[PDB]
């Protein structure tokens, strides 16, 4: 028995190692990221998380990138500069995957990209999964 | 509030427009495909579905690709060649996605690649979404 | 040691206790022995040539 999961839980590419694609989370009420590495890394690779606002000239085109603000939890540390980031540790192996998501939505489009385009940044793939279509 | 959907429904890249990556599905009991196009197409693009099995030399590395066979339904007609195929229509709109799945599993790895590599097959992106874990 | 270079050493083997205890003259009657606890512990921890 198999199901057409893509009907209920579609997924979209977010990072290929050479470019980043904005993902429209507007119609879906929940989402999360997923990471995987296709080769051994040389050091941790930090990723910046952005979001876009609807452009003026068109209601379905993303605007310029806006950096997502941090959100401290019930108690604990806060990011040094008050922003959100994710760091992929060096100990990660090729045959494993990592999952994570931000606590809040903000704009209707979301995106993610590395801090610097180095040789290691090309070894990481990022995919976005959405759940519970609302429209 | 949004959840960490990446923990229960991880997804992986299959075809990013230049390369095809084998996806290991044995750890999950359901899966499906999602097709998105990032601009207008010029003609129909057909895709072949493959599956692999553990290589003789190493039990965690895939062997050469084998092509998935077709299976007909109750009130239906088998395809002429007896092999599974997926074709994306020319009239597909950029701002929508289509999801389809295969009825059977076969080997523990699955893959997908266009029948012909050209300037049109590079406009499509395919991502595989799993469901349920058993390890 | 070896016959070419003998090495005389004081010793106390299992059979010495047996000989000593059994050599008591029979006429004098039943006897009782007195000894230190470590001596009995040493006696009870003997092993033959094979380690048993």
């Amino acid at each position: 028995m198999n199901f057409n999961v893509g009907v209920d839980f579609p997924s979209f590419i977010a990072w290929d190692g050479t470019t980043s694609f904005p993902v429209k989370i507007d119609g879906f009420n929940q989402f999360g990221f997923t990471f995987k590495v296709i080769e051994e890394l040389t050091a941790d690779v930090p990723f910046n998380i952005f979001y876009h606002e609807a452009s003026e000239a068109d209601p379905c085109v993303p605007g310029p990138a806006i950096r997502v603000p941090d959100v401290p939890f019930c108690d604990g540390v806060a990011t040094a500069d008050g922003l959100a980031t994710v760091v992929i540790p060096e100990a990660v192996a090729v045959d494993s995957f990592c999952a994570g998501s931000v606590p809040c939505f903000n704009g209707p489009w979301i995106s993610i990209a590395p801090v610097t385009v180095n040789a290691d940044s090309a070894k990481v793939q990022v995919t976005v999964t959405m759940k519970g279509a609302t429209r | 509030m949004n959840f960490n959907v990446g923990v229960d429904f991880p997804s992986f890249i299959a075809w990013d427009g230049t390369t095809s990556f084998p996806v290991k599905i044995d750890g999950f009991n359901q899966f499906g495909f999602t097709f998105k196009v990032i601009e207008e197409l010029t003609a129909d693009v057909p895709f072949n579905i493959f599956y692999h099995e553990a290589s003789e030399a190493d039990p965690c590395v895939p062997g050469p690709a084998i092509r998935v066979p077709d299976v007909p339904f109750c009130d239906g007609v088998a395809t002429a060649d007896g092999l599974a195929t997926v074709v994306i229509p020319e009239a597909v709109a950029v701002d929508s996605f289509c999801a389809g799945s295969v009825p059977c599993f076969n080997g523990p790895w699955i893959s997908i690649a266009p029948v012909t590599v050209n300037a049109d097959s590079a406009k499509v992106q395919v991502t595989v979404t799993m469901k349920g874990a058993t390890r | 040691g070896t016959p070419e270079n003998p090495v005389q050493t004081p010793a106390f083997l299992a059979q010495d206790w047996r000989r000593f205890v059994t050599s008591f003259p029979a006429e004098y009657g039943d006897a009782r022995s007195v000894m230190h606890q470590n001596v009995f512990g040493y006696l009870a921890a003997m092993v033959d040539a094979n380690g048993r």
Binding site: V77, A84, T85, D95, F97 | - | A49
Partner: peptide, 27 residues
């Protein structure tokens, strides 16, 4: 900063030797 969740896709059981006492040799 977000906390990730990690899980492996493959497994390889640890293979450790077991050692046993050597044969008796007089001290």
């Amino acid at each position: 900063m977000i906390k990730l969740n990690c899980r492996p896709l493959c497994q390889t059981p640890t293979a450790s030797r077991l050692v046993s006492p050597p044969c008796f040799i007089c001290r």
